[PDB]
Amino acid sequence: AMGSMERASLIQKAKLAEQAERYEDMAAFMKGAVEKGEELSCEERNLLSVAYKNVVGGQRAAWRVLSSIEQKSNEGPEVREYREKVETELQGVCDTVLGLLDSHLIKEAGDAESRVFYLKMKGDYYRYLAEVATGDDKKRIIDSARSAYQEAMDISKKEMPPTNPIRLGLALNFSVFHYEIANSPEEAISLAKTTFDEAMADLHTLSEDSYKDSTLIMQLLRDNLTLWT
Amino acid sequence: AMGSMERASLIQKAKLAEQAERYEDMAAFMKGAVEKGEELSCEERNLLSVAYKNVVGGQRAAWRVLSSIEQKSNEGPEVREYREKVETELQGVCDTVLGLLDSHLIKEAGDAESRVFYLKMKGDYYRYLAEVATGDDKKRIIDSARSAYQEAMDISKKEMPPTNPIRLGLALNFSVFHYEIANSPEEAISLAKTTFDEAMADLHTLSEDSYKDSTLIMQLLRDNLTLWT
Amino acid sequence: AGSIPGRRS
Amino acid sequence: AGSIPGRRS
Ligand SMILES: *Cc1ccc(C(=O)N2CCC[C@@H](O)C2)cc1
Ligand SMILES: *Cc1ccc(C(=O)N2CCC[C@@H](O)C2)cc1
Ligand SMILES: [Ca+2]
Ligand SMILES: [Ca+2]
Ligand SMILES: [Cl-]
Ligand SMILES: [Cl-]
Ligand SMILES: [Cl-]
Ligand SMILES: [Cl-]
């Protein structure tokens, strides 16, 4: 759709759409930028991620409202039909993101910071698919999420310091995967605790600004541990 | 688009979309309900109004962000181009609502409560068009807004008590039209003051619940007067 | 200057 | 249980 617009204009307009809180537009502009075929810079990867997280975040919130109403009514077809419509739209957005990662962001990502970033994305969007999955494929979707997160974890442990914000956010979301999707709360708690403690021990190496970035995500791990224990 | 869905299902799904904060869907469902050709009940009119007010409210907020950036830069073509895109989308939504009012909500509205409601809508969506208008037609758009508001005022003064919430909200928005669009702040202040005072003098006639409905909108008039004086 | 919020019903 | 908010950048 964005084939006729310059890559740099797409990136500029994604930033404008973020300022305007027009996240559907933002995601379309970043989809167009990815489809130009060039690798993405650190800032550009964040724009891609912020755009789709906002879009699918709104869809997930709507799906949960409608699923709750639907469950209350099972204690006409309209509530189920409308939940299905929202669910289909959500799955389509997740499939679009996964398609961008597979064609061809992940395979061209050689540096640890890009490869871990995209694989965390892959785990997250399969996790969103798993949230609404029921039938023949819920297990395969869950294992796809797990496998992406696991590969990202293995790279992040080898290549990044324990305070790296992408490494910390990956561990946070993998722990949420364990708790909420995989029915493994003990694994979720262990991962969040070990991640927090190894970050704490590395904080002394950081500048004032890096310290702020890392401790912010460490607080999210602690918030989860407080909720889980 | 909604031609194959039952009217009552469209209304039920508009209520669901409101709960899910899916206002674009809400507006499409209510557009489909209007296009069934039957008059709308009081509740249904409110659903129609809430849906499009939320949609165009988001577009107006985005347009203002982008217009502000555009003005700062005039002190590449991307900011102007993107503001134009948002502006075109906003105008299309306003035209869609005005089309529903013209085909055929207004002409079939015989009771004061429905006719004033739709004419206030007509004034509001021309006001939104006037906010972004510049060229050959800004004056004609402004006069279209004025004329709709004026007809609604004339009916509301003849047919409704001074505390009627639709009469009060019409006067509120016509006063905003005067202040913000027509460059007539004195007319805006006079209208809001006279509306407030005549409502105050009628409050003694109301039940506890009606009193709450009326005093809430009176407070909005007072908030404007405080800002304007 | 506030118009009718009109965003909830 | 909160994942990365990830909604602002
Ligand atoms: C998944 C994820 C993890 C962490 C962040 C984050 O907070 N930052 C801030 C500073 C460095 C950025 O690359 C990422 C965002 C997403
Ligand atoms: C335009 C407008 C004016 C007033 C309202 C409002 O507050 N209510 C509450 C109770 C009666 C309803 O018909 C309208 C909404 C929109
Ligand atoms: Ca080029
Ligand atoms: Ca029918
Ligand atoms: Cl539906
Ligand atoms: Cl590469
Ligand atoms: Cl554009
Ligand atoms: Cl009639």
Short mmCIF file of C-alpha atoms and ligand atoms in Angstrom, two decimals:
data_model
loop_
_atom_site.label_atom_id
_atom_site.label_comp_id
_atom_site.label_asym_id
_atom_site.label_seq_id
_atom_site.Cartn_x
_atom_site.Cartn_y
_atom_site.Cartn_z
CA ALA A 1 0.00 0.00 0.00
CA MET A 2 2.94 2.28 0.85
CA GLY A 3 5.01 1.21 -2.12
CA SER A 4 5.09 4.65 -3.72
CA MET A 5 6.24 6.55 -0.60
CA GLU A 6 9.93 7.08 0.25
CA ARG A 7 11.29 5.05 3.15
CA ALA A 8 12.39 8.16 5.01
CA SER A 9 8.93 9.75 4.58
CA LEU A 10 7.30 6.58 5.97
CA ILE A 11 9.57 6.81 9.03
CA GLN A 12 8.88 10.53 9.47
CA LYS A 13 5.12 9.93 9.21
CA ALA A 14 5.29 7.03 11.69
CA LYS A 15 6.80 9.48 14.19
CA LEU A 16 4.06 12.00 13.46
CA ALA A 17 1.35 9.37 13.86
CA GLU A 18 2.83 8.41 17.22
CA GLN A 19 2.58 12.05 18.32
CA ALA A 20 -1.02 12.16 17.06
CA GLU A 21 -1.81 8.84 18.81
CA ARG A 22 -2.81 7.41 15.42
CA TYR A 23 -1.39 3.95 15.99
CA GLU A 24 -3.15 2.18 13.11
CA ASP A 25 -1.55 4.69 10.74
CA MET A 26 1.77 4.33 12.57
CA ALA A 27 1.70 0.56 12.02
CA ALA A 28 0.84 0.90 8.35
CA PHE A 29 3.69 3.37 7.83
CA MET A 30 6.17 1.06 9.62
CA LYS A 31 4.86 -1.96 7.67
CA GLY A 32 5.60 0.01 4.49
CA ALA A 33 9.11 0.87 5.80
CA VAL A 34 9.89 -2.79 6.54
CA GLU A 35 8.66 -3.79 3.08
CA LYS A 36 11.31 -1.52 1.54
CA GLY A 37 13.62 -4.43 2.27
CA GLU A 38 16.39 -2.64 4.22
CA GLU A 39 17.31 -3.57 7.78
CA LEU A 40 15.87 -1.37 10.54
CA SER A 41 17.89 0.80 12.91
CA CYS A 42 17.43 0.64 16.69
CA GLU A 43 15.04 3.61 16.66
CA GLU A 44 13.11 2.19 13.70
CA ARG A 45 12.70 -1.19 15.41
CA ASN A 46 11.20 0.62 18.39
CA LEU A 47 8.78 2.50 16.12
CA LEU A 48 7.66 -0.80 14.56
CA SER A 49 7.21 -2.39 17.98
CA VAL A 50 5.39 0.58 19.57
CA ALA A 51 2.96 0.84 16.66
CA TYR A 52 1.82 -2.77 16.63
CA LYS A 53 1.83 -3.08 20.40
CA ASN A 54 -0.65 -0.26 20.63
CA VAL A 55 -2.86 -1.68 17.85
CA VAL A 56 -2.97 -5.20 19.24
CA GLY A 57 -3.20 -3.82 22.78
CA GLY A 58 -6.50 -2.15 21.91
CA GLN A 59 -7.73 -5.34 20.23
CA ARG A 60 -6.79 -7.48 23.24
CA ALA A 61 -8.56 -5.12 25.63
CA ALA A 62 -11.71 -5.24 23.46
CA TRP A 63 -11.54 -9.02 23.15
CA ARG A 64 -11.33 -9.39 26.93
CA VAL A 65 -14.38 -7.15 27.45
CA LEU A 66 -16.37 -9.16 24.91
CA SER A 67 -15.14 -12.57 26.17
CA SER A 68 -16.24 -11.61 29.68
CA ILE A 69 -19.72 -10.63 28.48
CA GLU A 70 -19.92 -13.83 26.43
CA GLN A 71 -19.02 -15.97 29.44
CA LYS A 72 -21.62 -14.23 31.61
CA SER A 73 -24.29 -15.00 29.00
CA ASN A 74 -23.32 -18.72 29.07
CA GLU A 75 -24.28 -19.38 32.69
CA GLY A 76 -28.72 -14.47 20.77
CA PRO A 77 -25.58 -15.04 18.67
CA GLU A 78 -24.57 -11.37 18.70
CA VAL A 79 -22.01 -11.34 21.53
CA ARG A 80 -20.26 -14.45 20.22
CA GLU A 81 -20.39 -13.13 16.66
CA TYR A 82 -18.88 -9.79 17.64
CA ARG A 83 -16.20 -11.38 19.85
CA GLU A 84 -15.34 -13.58 16.85
CA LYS A 85 -15.06 -10.51 14.60
CA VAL A 86 -12.68 -8.78 17.01
CA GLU A 87 -10.76 -12.05 17.49
CA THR A 88 -10.33 -12.47 13.73
CA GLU A 89 -9.08 -8.90 13.38
CA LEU A 90 -6.59 -9.42 16.20
CA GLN A 91 -5.32 -12.66 14.66
CA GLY A 92 -4.87 -10.86 11.38
CA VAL A 93 -2.70 -8.16 12.98
CA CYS A 94 -0.60 -10.80 14.77
CA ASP A 95 -0.19 -12.72 11.50
CA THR A 96 0.89 -9.52 9.75
CA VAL A 97 3.60 -8.81 12.32
CA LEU A 98 4.80 -12.41 12.30
CA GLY A 99 4.92 -12.22 8.52
CA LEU A 100 7.15 -9.14 8.65
CA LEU A 101 9.48 -10.91 11.09
CA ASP A 102 9.61 -13.98 8.84
CA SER A 103 9.96 -11.95 5.58
CA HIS A 104 12.67 -11.03 6.20
CA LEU A 105 13.58 -9.18 9.40
CA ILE A 106 14.78 -12.14 11.49
CA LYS A 107 16.88 -13.83 8.86
CA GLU A 108 18.76 -10.62 8.09
CA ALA A 109 19.30 -9.75 11.79
CA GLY A 110 22.89 -10.62 12.73
CA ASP A 111 23.65 -8.42 15.69
CA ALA A 112 22.52 -9.57 19.11
CA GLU A 113 20.49 -6.39 19.78
CA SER A 114 18.45 -6.76 16.58
CA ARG A 115 18.10 -10.54 16.63
CA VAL A 116 16.95 -10.68 20.29
CA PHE A 117 14.56 -7.77 19.67
CA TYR A 118 12.83 -9.48 16.74
CA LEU A 119 12.70 -12.87 18.43
CA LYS A 120 11.12 -11.32 21.53
CA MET A 121 8.54 -9.76 19.14
CA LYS A 122 7.94 -13.20 17.62
CA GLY A 123 7.35 -14.68 21.09
CA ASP A 124 5.02 -11.81 22.03
CA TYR A 125 2.77 -12.06 18.92
CA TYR A 126 2.47 -15.85 19.23
CA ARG A 127 1.63 -15.22 22.89
CA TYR A 128 -1.20 -12.92 21.79
CA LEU A 129 -2.41 -15.63 19.39
CA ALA A 130 -2.24 -18.15 22.26
CA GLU A 131 -4.43 -15.89 24.45
CA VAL A 132 -7.42 -16.39 22.10
CA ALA A 133 -6.57 -19.89 20.86
CA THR A 134 -8.72 -22.87 21.73
CA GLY A 135 -8.79 -25.61 19.07
CA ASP A 136 -6.38 -27.94 17.27
CA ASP A 137 -3.52 -25.47 17.37
CA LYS A 138 -3.43 -23.90 20.84
CA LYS A 139 -0.57 -26.23 21.78
CA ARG A 140 1.39 -25.57 18.61
CA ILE A 141 0.93 -21.80 19.03
CA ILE A 142 2.16 -21.98 22.63
CA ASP A 143 5.21 -23.95 21.54
CA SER A 144 5.93 -21.42 18.80
CA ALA A 145 5.89 -18.65 21.41
CA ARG A 146 8.12 -20.68 23.75
CA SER A 147 10.62 -21.49 21.03
CA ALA A 148 11.02 -17.87 19.94
CA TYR A 149 11.42 -16.65 23.52
CA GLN A 150 13.90 -19.44 24.29
CA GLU A 151 16.11 -18.65 21.30
CA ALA A 152 16.08 -14.97 22.28
CA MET A 153 16.96 -15.89 25.89
CA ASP A 154 19.86 -18.06 24.81
CA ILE A 155 21.35 -15.22 22.68
CA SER A 156 20.71 -12.55 25.30
CA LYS A 157 22.47 -14.58 28.01
CA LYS A 158 25.52 -15.07 25.78
CA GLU A 159 25.73 -11.61 24.19
CA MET A 160 24.21 -8.98 26.47
CA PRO A 161 24.87 -7.73 30.02
CA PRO A 162 22.24 -8.65 32.62
CA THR A 163 21.07 -5.03 32.79
CA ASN A 164 20.47 -4.63 29.05
CA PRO A 165 16.88 -3.29 28.74
CA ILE A 166 16.00 -5.63 25.86
CA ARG A 167 17.33 -8.62 27.83
CA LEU A 168 15.31 -7.51 30.88
CA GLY A 169 12.10 -6.93 28.90
CA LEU A 170 12.49 -10.28 27.17
CA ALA A 171 12.81 -12.01 30.52
CA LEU A 172 9.82 -10.05 31.88
CA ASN A 173 7.58 -11.11 28.98
CA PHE A 174 8.84 -14.71 28.96
CA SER A 175 7.97 -14.86 32.66
CA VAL A 176 4.47 -13.57 31.85
CA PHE A 177 4.27 -16.26 29.16
CA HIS A 178 5.13 -18.89 31.79
CA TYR A 179 2.62 -17.55 34.30
CA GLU A 180 -0.31 -16.74 32.05
CA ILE A 181 -0.03 -19.09 29.07
CA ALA A 182 2.09 -22.12 29.99
CA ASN A 183 0.54 -22.71 33.43
CA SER A 184 4.05 -22.68 34.95
CA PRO A 185 3.90 -20.09 37.74
CA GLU A 186 6.97 -21.50 39.49
CA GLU A 187 9.03 -21.08 36.31
CA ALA A 188 7.65 -17.53 35.97
CA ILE A 189 8.64 -16.63 39.54
CA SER A 190 12.09 -18.23 39.27
CA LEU A 191 12.86 -16.45 36.02
CA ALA A 192 11.75 -13.05 37.30
CA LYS A 193 13.73 -13.46 40.58
CA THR A 194 16.94 -14.62 38.89
CA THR A 195 16.63 -11.86 36.26
CA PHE A 196 16.12 -9.23 38.93
CA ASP A 197 18.99 -10.40 41.13
CA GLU A 198 21.50 -10.65 38.26
CA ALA A 199 20.55 -7.17 37.09
CA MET A 200 20.90 -5.73 40.61
CA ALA A 201 24.46 -7.07 40.79
CA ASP A 202 25.39 -5.40 37.46
CA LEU A 203 23.94 -1.94 38.19
CA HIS A 204 27.26 -0.65 39.51
CA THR A 205 28.65 -0.70 35.94
CA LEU A 206 26.09 1.74 34.51
CA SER A 207 25.88 5.46 33.86
CA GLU A 208 23.12 7.51 35.49
CA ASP A 209 20.96 7.30 32.36
CA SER A 210 21.49 3.56 31.82
CA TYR A 211 20.77 2.96 35.52
CA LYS A 212 17.39 4.70 35.05
CA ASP A 213 16.55 2.59 31.98
CA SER A 214 17.45 -0.71 33.74
CA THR A 215 15.89 -0.02 37.13
CA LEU A 216 12.61 0.93 35.47
CA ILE A 217 12.23 -2.56 33.98
CA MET A 218 13.53 -4.18 37.13
CA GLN A 219 10.63 -2.54 38.95
CA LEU A 220 8.21 -4.23 36.55
CA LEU A 221 9.76 -7.61 37.41
CA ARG A 222 9.38 -6.77 41.09
CA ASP A 223 5.76 -5.72 40.61
CA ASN A 224 5.01 -9.13 39.08
CA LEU A 225 6.81 -10.99 41.86
CA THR A 226 4.76 -9.03 44.40
CA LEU A 227 1.59 -10.02 42.61
CA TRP A 228 2.67 -13.68 42.30
CA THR A 229 4.04 -14.34 45.76
CA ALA B 1 -22.18 -2.82 4.41
CA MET B 2 -24.55 -3.86 7.22
CA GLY B 3 -27.44 -4.58 4.90
CA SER B 4 -27.63 -8.27 5.76
CA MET B 5 -27.70 -7.82 9.57
CA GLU B 6 -30.96 -7.40 11.53
CA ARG B 7 -31.66 -3.92 12.89
CA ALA B 8 -31.91 -5.20 16.44
CA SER B 9 -28.57 -7.04 16.12
CA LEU B 10 -26.92 -3.84 14.84
CA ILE B 11 -28.24 -1.99 17.91
CA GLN B 12 -27.11 -4.76 20.26
CA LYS B 13 -23.63 -4.78 18.69
CA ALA B 14 -23.39 -0.97 18.87
CA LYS B 15 -23.92 -1.29 22.64
CA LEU B 16 -21.27 -4.01 22.84
CA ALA B 17 -18.81 -1.92 20.83
CA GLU B 18 -19.40 0.99 23.20
CA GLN B 19 -18.52 -1.28 26.13
CA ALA B 20 -15.41 -2.46 24.26
CA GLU B 21 -14.48 1.16 23.39
CA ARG B 22 -14.58 0.19 19.70
CA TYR B 23 -16.10 3.43 18.47
CA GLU B 24 -15.38 2.96 14.75
CA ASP B 25 -17.32 -0.31 14.90
CA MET B 26 -20.03 1.38 16.96
CA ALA B 27 -20.46 4.05 14.29
CA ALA B 28 -20.62 1.52 11.48
CA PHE B 29 -23.26 -0.50 13.34
CA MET B 30 -25.35 2.64 14.00
CA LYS B 31 -24.92 3.77 10.37
CA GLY B 32 -26.31 0.37 9.34
CA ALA B 33 -29.23 0.79 11.80
CA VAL B 34 -30.12 4.22 10.40
CA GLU B 35 -29.98 2.84 6.85
CA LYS B 36 -32.72 0.36 7.76
CA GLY B 37 -35.00 3.33 7.21
CA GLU B 38 -36.96 3.32 10.51
CA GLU B 39 -36.95 6.28 12.90
CA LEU B 40 -34.62 6.03 15.90
CA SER B 41 -35.70 5.90 19.54
CA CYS B 42 -34.23 8.23 22.17
CA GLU B 43 -31.68 5.62 23.26
CA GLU B 44 -30.77 4.81 19.65
CA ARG B 45 -30.23 8.49 18.82
CA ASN B 46 -27.81 8.68 21.74
CA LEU B 47 -25.94 5.61 20.48
CA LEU B 48 -25.60 7.20 17.03
CA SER B 49 -24.38 10.47 18.55
CA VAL B 50 -21.93 8.88 21.01
CA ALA B 51 -20.37 6.71 18.31
CA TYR B 52 -19.63 9.47 15.82
CA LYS B 53 -18.64 11.96 18.49
CA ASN B 54 -15.93 9.61 19.66
CA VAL B 55 -14.71 8.89 16.11
CA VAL B 56 -14.55 12.51 15.03
CA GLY B 57 -13.23 13.50 18.47
CA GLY B 58 -10.16 11.34 17.90
CA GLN B 59 -9.73 12.77 14.39
CA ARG B 60 -10.01 16.36 15.65
CA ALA B 61 -7.44 15.73 18.38
CA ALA B 62 -5.03 14.25 15.80
CA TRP B 63 -5.63 17.09 13.37
CA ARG B 64 -4.83 19.66 16.06
CA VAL B 65 -1.56 17.90 16.96
CA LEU B 66 -0.54 17.81 13.29
CA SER B 67 -1.69 21.39 12.55
CA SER B 68 0.42 22.62 15.47
CA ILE B 69 3.50 20.79 14.20
CA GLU B 70 2.84 22.11 10.69
CA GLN B 71 2.61 25.69 11.94
CA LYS B 72 5.85 25.35 13.90
CA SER B 73 7.62 24.17 10.74
CA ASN B 74 6.37 27.27 8.84
CA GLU B 75 8.21 29.86 10.92
CA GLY B 76 9.66 18.43 3.63
CA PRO B 77 6.03 17.93 2.56
CA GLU B 78 5.41 15.11 5.04
CA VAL B 79 3.74 17.01 7.90
CA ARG B 80 1.41 18.87 5.54
CA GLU B 81 0.68 15.69 3.60
CA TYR B 82 -0.19 13.75 6.75
CA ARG B 83 -2.29 16.58 8.20
CA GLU B 84 -4.14 16.63 4.85
CA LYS B 85 -4.74 12.87 5.06
CA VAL B 86 -6.20 13.14 8.56
CA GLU B 87 -8.21 16.22 7.50
CA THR B 88 -9.69 14.35 4.53
CA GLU B 89 -10.65 11.42 6.73
CA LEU B 90 -12.31 13.74 9.24
CA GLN B 91 -14.25 15.52 6.49
CA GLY B 92 -15.41 12.18 5.21
CA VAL B 93 -16.80 11.17 8.61
CA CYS B 94 -18.56 14.54 8.97
CA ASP B 95 -20.03 14.17 5.47
CA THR B 96 -21.24 10.66 6.35
CA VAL B 97 -23.07 11.88 9.46
CA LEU B 98 -24.55 14.86 7.62
CA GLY B 99 -25.69 12.46 4.91
CA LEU B 100 -27.51 10.30 7.46
CA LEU B 101 -29.23 13.38 8.89
CA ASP B 102 -30.26 14.49 5.40
CA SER B 103 -31.29 10.97 4.24
CA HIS B 104 -33.63 10.86 5.99
CA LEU B 105 -33.46 11.37 9.76
CA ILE B 106 -34.31 15.08 9.91
CA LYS B 107 -37.19 15.06 7.49
CA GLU B 108 -38.91 12.21 9.33
CA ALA B 109 -38.34 13.77 12.79
CA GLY B 110 -41.59 15.36 13.96
CA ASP B 111 -41.31 15.44 17.72
CA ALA B 112 -39.40 18.29 19.31
CA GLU B 113 -36.98 15.97 21.16
CA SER B 114 -35.93 14.17 17.96
CA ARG B 115 -35.93 17.17 15.65
CA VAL B 116 -33.84 19.36 18.01
CA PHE B 117 -31.46 16.44 18.62
CA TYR B 118 -30.76 15.90 14.92
CA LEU B 119 -30.48 19.61 14.14
CA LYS B 120 -27.98 20.07 16.98
CA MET B 121 -26.02 17.16 15.40
CA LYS B 122 -26.18 18.94 12.03
CA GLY B 123 -24.80 22.14 13.61
CA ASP B 124 -22.05 20.19 15.39
CA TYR B 125 -20.77 18.33 12.28
CA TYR B 126 -20.75 21.51 10.17
CA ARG B 127 -18.89 23.11 13.08
CA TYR B 128 -16.26 20.36 12.85
CA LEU B 129 -16.02 20.98 9.09
CA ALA B 130 -15.63 24.71 9.80
CA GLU B 131 -12.72 24.02 12.21
CA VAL B 132 -10.55 22.73 9.31
CA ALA B 133 -12.03 24.87 6.52
CA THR B 134 -10.00 27.56 4.82
CA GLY B 135 -10.92 28.16 1.16
CA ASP B 136 -13.93 29.17 -0.93
CA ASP B 137 -16.42 27.53 1.40
CA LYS B 138 -15.41 28.35 4.98
CA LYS B 139 -18.10 31.03 5.08
CA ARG B 140 -20.79 28.80 3.62
CA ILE B 141 -19.89 25.99 6.06
CA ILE B 142 -20.10 28.40 9.00
CA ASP B 143 -23.50 29.61 7.85
CA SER B 144 -24.70 26.02 7.47
CA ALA B 145 -23.69 25.36 11.09
CA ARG B 146 -25.37 28.58 12.25
CA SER B 147 -28.59 27.84 10.41
CA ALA B 148 -28.93 24.34 11.85
CA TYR B 149 -28.22 25.54 15.39
CA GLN B 150 -30.64 28.45 14.98
CA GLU B 151 -33.51 26.25 13.80
CA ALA B 152 -32.86 23.89 16.72
CA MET B 153 -32.81 26.85 19.15
CA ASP B 154 -36.08 28.21 17.83
CA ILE B 155 -37.82 24.82 18.32
CA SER B 156 -36.25 24.19 21.72
CA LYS B 157 -37.38 27.58 23.03
CA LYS B 158 -40.95 26.93 21.89
CA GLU B 159 -41.27 23.24 22.81
CA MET B 160 -38.95 22.36 25.68
CA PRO B 161 -38.49 23.54 29.28
CA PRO B 162 -35.35 25.58 29.99
CA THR B 163 -33.84 22.68 31.95
CA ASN B 164 -34.25 20.07 29.19
CA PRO B 165 -30.78 18.49 28.78
CA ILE B 166 -30.94 18.56 24.97
CA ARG B 167 -31.96 22.24 25.04
CA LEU B 168 -29.08 22.98 27.45
CA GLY B 169 -26.50 21.05 25.43
CA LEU B 170 -27.65 22.72 22.23
CA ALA B 171 -27.20 26.13 23.82
CA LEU B 172 -23.79 25.10 25.19
CA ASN B 173 -22.53 24.01 21.76
CA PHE B 174 -24.08 26.99 19.94
CA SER B 175 -22.25 29.23 22.41
CA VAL B 176 -19.00 27.40 21.61
CA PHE B 177 -19.80 27.91 17.92
CA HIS B 178 -20.14 31.66 18.58
CA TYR B 179 -16.93 31.86 20.59
CA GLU B 180 -14.66 29.60 18.57
CA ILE B 181 -15.97 29.72 14.99
CA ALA B 182 -18.03 32.89 14.46
CA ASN B 183 -15.65 35.26 16.29
CA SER B 184 -18.60 36.47 18.41
CA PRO B 185 -17.45 36.05 22.03
CA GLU B 186 -20.04 38.50 23.35
CA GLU B 187 -22.84 36.47 21.76
CA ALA B 188 -21.29 33.30 23.23
CA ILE B 189 -21.17 34.81 26.73
CA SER B 190 -24.70 36.24 26.52
CA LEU B 191 -26.16 32.95 25.34
CA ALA B 192 -24.43 30.90 28.03
CA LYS B 193 -25.46 33.36 30.80
CA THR B 194 -29.11 33.58 29.72
CA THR B 195 -29.28 29.79 29.29
CA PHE B 196 -27.81 29.23 32.73
CA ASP B 197 -30.07 31.74 34.48
CA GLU B 198 -33.28 30.46 32.85
CA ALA B 199 -32.36 26.90 33.78
CA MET B 200 -31.60 27.88 37.39
CA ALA B 201 -35.09 29.39 37.70
CA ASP B 202 -36.73 26.16 36.44
CA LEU B 203 -34.83 23.70 38.66
CA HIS B 204 -37.53 23.76 41.33
CA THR B 205 -39.84 21.80 38.98
CA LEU B 206 -37.55 18.77 38.65
CA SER B 207 -37.18 15.40 40.32
CA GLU B 208 -33.91 14.47 42.02
CA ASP B 209 -32.71 12.57 38.94
CA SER B 210 -33.72 15.29 36.45
CA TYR B 211 -32.06 17.90 38.69
CA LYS B 212 -28.79 15.92 38.44
CA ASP B 213 -29.03 15.70 34.64
CA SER B 214 -29.72 19.46 34.25
CA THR B 215 -27.23 20.79 36.80
CA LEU B 216 -24.46 18.74 35.21
CA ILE B 217 -24.82 20.60 31.90
CA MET B 218 -25.36 23.89 33.67
CA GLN B 219 -21.93 23.39 35.22
CA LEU B 220 -20.43 23.09 31.74
CA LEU B 221 -21.99 26.44 30.80
CA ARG B 222 -20.54 27.93 33.98
CA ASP B 223 -17.11 26.46 33.25
CA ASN B 224 -17.13 28.21 29.86
CA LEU B 225 -18.27 31.51 31.35
CA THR B 226 -15.42 31.27 33.87
CA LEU B 227 -12.97 30.71 31.07
CA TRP B 228 -14.43 33.54 28.94
CA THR B 229 -14.85 36.25 31.54
CA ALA C 1 -13.95 26.16 25.79
CA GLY C 2 -15.81 22.88 26.26
CA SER C 3 -18.65 21.57 24.10
CA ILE C 4 -20.85 18.68 25.28
CA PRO C 5 -18.44 15.80 25.96
CA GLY C 6 -20.99 13.41 24.57
CA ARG C 7 -18.57 10.49 24.53
CA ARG C 8 -20.33 8.11 26.99
CA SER C 9 -23.85 6.60 26.60
CA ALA D 1 0.66 -9.63 35.65
CA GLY D 2 2.27 -6.90 33.55
CA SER D 3 4.28 -7.41 30.36
CA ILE D 4 6.44 -4.60 28.93
CA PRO D 5 4.04 -1.67 28.39
CA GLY D 6 5.88 -0.83 25.21
CA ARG D 7 3.28 1.70 24.10
CA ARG D 8 5.43 4.90 24.07
CA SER D 9 8.55 5.54 21.91
C1 LIG E 1 10.75 -5.27 24.92
C2 LIG E 1 11.30 -3.96 25.47
C3 LIG E 1 12.20 -3.94 26.53
C4 LIG E 1 12.68 -2.75 27.02
C5 LIG E 1 12.25 -1.55 26.44
C6 LIG E 1 12.81 -0.23 27.00
O1 LIG E 1 12.39 0.17 28.03
N1 LIG E 1 13.82 0.52 26.27
C7 LIG E 1 14.41 1.83 26.77
C8 LIG E 1 15.86 2.16 26.41
C9 LIG E 1 16.43 1.28 25.36
C10 LIG E 1 15.43 0.90 24.33
O2 LIG E 1 16.03 0.15 23.31
C11 LIG E 1 14.36 0.02 24.95
C12 LIG E 1 11.35 -1.56 25.38
C13 LIG E 1 10.88 -2.77 24.88
C1 LIG E 2 -26.14 17.23 23.04
C2 LIG E 2 -26.39 16.56 24.39
C3 LIG E 2 -26.97 17.26 25.44
C4 LIG E 2 -27.18 16.64 26.66
C5 LIG E 2 -26.82 15.31 26.81
C6 LIG E 2 -27.07 14.63 28.18
O1 LIG E 2 -26.36 14.89 29.08
N1 LIG E 2 -28.18 13.70 28.34
C7 LIG E 2 -28.48 13.01 29.67
C8 LIG E 2 -29.94 12.66 29.99
C9 LIG E 2 -30.85 12.79 28.83
C10 LIG E 2 -30.21 12.38 27.55
O2 LIG E 2 -31.13 12.43 26.50
C11 LIG E 2 -29.09 13.35 27.20
C12 LIG E 2 -26.25 14.59 25.76
C13 LIG E 2 -26.05 15.22 24.54
CA CA E 3 13.82 5.61 -2.29
CA CA E 4 -35.52 -7.37 9.80
CL CL E 5 -20.22 -8.81 14.14
CL CL E 6 22.31 -8.07 8.81
CL CL E 7 0.23 10.76 4.31
CL CL E 8 -41.88 10.94 12.37
#
